[PDB]
């Protein structure tokens, strides 16, 4: 089992993920927290992830990574380079579509990165 | 898929009743909270199980079933009062922490099946 777990205040986009990478993946399990503590208290009590997608600050990142950088971390110019120094593994527009937030989640779950034409 | 949430400040007791069930249920996942703090939280957040296992207190139960009584909730505890108390408070189960782990697992079972269960001593 593939397991997301996305880390966002609104339900609305949690659900909205949860409901279309489940749907588009066979062995996929999307989990929600609504803060970077509630994530990394999640995370303590053993929950194992494959990717945490986090929304957008860039202490979040670090600090989710300093918990454990074997989980890549993806967020949701200067904050996309910012992130990839900190070892993000890519960065989706909210604003993106159905099908690219699943293929990037592909590519991240594969060990690639997705990052934003604009930014390349 | 069958959803145990074990909420327990102990890695080892965690970790030891994840593979005990998950080992024994084909169907289930087991997640942790570290306290009934986090647990609310992960349940507020729209988090779905089936199961709450939690460790001892009685005012954590409480909190857990006010906030959604449609989840079976076992104390696992250490320690008839305290039971007493536990099953007026709604408390589907009570299981000793020195069970024999197969005693776990058939507490477990009955518990999903909507049945109690309760030690000997009581």
Redesign the interface.
């Known amino acids: 089992?593939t397991v997301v777990l996305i880390v966002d205040d609104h339900?609305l986009i949690?659900?909205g993920a949860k409901n279309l990478l489940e749907g588009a993946f066979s062995g996929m399990?999307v989990?929600?927290?609504?803060t970077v503590s509630?994530a990394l208290?999640?995370l303590?009590?053993?929950?194992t992830v494959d990717l945490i997608l986090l929304d957008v600050a860039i202490d979040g990142l670090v600090r989710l990574k300093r918990f454990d950088p074997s989980n890549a971390v993806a967020l949701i110019h200067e904050l996309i380079r910012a992130a990839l120094e900190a070892g993000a593994d890519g960065f989706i527009p909210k604003s993106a579509d159905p099908q690219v937030l699943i293929h990037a989640v592909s590519l991240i779950l594969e060990g690639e990165i997705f990052l934003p034409r604009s930014y390349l």
């Open positions: 089992l339900h949690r659900a399990r989990e929600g927290a609504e509630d208290a999640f303590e009590a053993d929950n």
